[PDB]
């Protein structure tokens, strides 16, 4: 499957500093398109991608109301969770949630998602069947019991299989020039002496979209996984990403190393080496 739509919601309590803050950002792949923040002067759902701007007044009003109520729901959920864990009302806590759908090249549902984490630890998750739940502990089991009783999975499923896939398909059509375009990385190898004995060979990948990519080094055709330093893929700010991998090699043996790059915007994977 080639695409996904997903919402990343964060609710944070702050006793003595107001009601818990709620923020929700929506994405299509690695492209953000909406944001909602309860701490904004006038909280409303607002565009963060040009292709969502054409959407009408009713679209904005409806999603604004949806997130205002979700703000209340997650505040009540934070209260409940404090109870489930016998925590004091003095501490600060975080309730995160990710939900959405993945679709194939043809637009058909690959899989749905709906999970939560409390203070950075997995809490409850809708299973891939879109019918049952997996709870991480006895507190999560309380949420599971209430959800099973009210038949919540059935509501999430109707959305994840219907409405979510319909929105994703519409967004993909409206933003086809960017959402459906993969930008390949610009690549090269740099060389930095360390001493008379060793040097670093660093391999670059710049300007790529989407973020998914694989850079690896080999000495004499053998992957150097344990000896390679890799940095986390980082956003450039123009929608694209960057990344590098480095290896310290003995002076004079530079030609025994090759860097390999795989990216979806590349027809065939690349092989490069230091060119003095």
């Amino acid at each position: 499957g080639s695409h996904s739509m997903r919402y990343f919601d964060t609710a944070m309590s702050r006793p003595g500093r107001g009601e818990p803050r709620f923020i929700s950002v929506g994405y299509v792949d690695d492209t953000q398109f909406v944001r909602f923040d309860s701490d904004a002067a006038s909280p409303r759902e607002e565009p963060r991608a040009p292709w969502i701007e054409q959407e009408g007044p009713e679209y904005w009003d409806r999603n604004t109301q949806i997130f205002k109520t979700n703000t209340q729901t997650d505040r009540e959920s934070l209260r409940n969770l404090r109870g489930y864990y016998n925590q004091s009302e003095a501490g600060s806590h975080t309730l995160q949630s990710m939900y959405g759908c993945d679709v194939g090249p043809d637009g058909r549902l690959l899989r749905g998602h709906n999970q939560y984490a409390y203070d950075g630890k997995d809490y409850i998750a809708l299973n891939e069947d879109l019918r049952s739940w997996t709870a991480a502990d006895t507190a999560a089991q309380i949420t599971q019991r209430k959800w099973e009783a009210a038949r919540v999975a059935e509501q999430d499923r109707a959305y994840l299989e219907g409405t979510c896939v319909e929105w994703l398909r519409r967004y993909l059509e409206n933003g086809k020039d960017t959402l459906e375009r993969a930008d390949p990385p610009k690549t090269h190898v740099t060389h930095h002496p360390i001493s008379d004995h060793e040097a670093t060979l660093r391999c670059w990948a710049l300007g790529f979209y989407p973020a998914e990519i694989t850079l690896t080094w080999q000495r004499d055709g053998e992957d150097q996984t344990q000896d390679t330093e890799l940095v986390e893929t980082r956003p450039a700010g123009d929608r694209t990403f960057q990344k590098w991998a480095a290896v310290v090699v003995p002076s004079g043996e530079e030609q025994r190393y090759t860097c390999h790059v795989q990216h979806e915007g590349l027809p065939k994977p690349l092989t490069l080496r230091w060119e003095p």
Partner: protein, 99 residues
């Protein structure tokens, strides 16, 4: 649980002394979400500094991009200073043109 931020300082486009660019400070892999970031020019804080909306990775750790328009030179020193609950003193990372 608490996870300390990973910090990367770099430019949007390759650095060319005299050409306008964007200085980026990207913090990731941290929990909880409260964090304070400053972009420094020869030890001084830069005022025109923006940032991306709060979000997180598949493992629940947060990430934020802080950026500012700037023009590199051979003399100027740039850096990112970050404070988070996992840190005793603000951590300062110097911009390395080759990283």
């Amino acid at each position: 649980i608490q996870r300390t931020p990973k910090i990367q300082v770099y430019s949007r486009h390759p650095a060319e002394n005299g050409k306008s660019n964007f200085l980026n400070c990207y913090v990731s892999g941290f929990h909880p979400s409260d964090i304070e970031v400053d972009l420094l020019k020869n030890g001084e804080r830069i005022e025109k500094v923006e940032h991306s909306d709060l979000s997180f990775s598949k493992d629940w750790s947060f990430y934020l991009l802080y950026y500012t328009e700037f023009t590199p030179t051979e003399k100027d020193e740039y850096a990112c200073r970050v404070n988070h609950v996992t840190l005793s003193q603000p951590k300062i990372v110097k911009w390395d043109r080759d990283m």
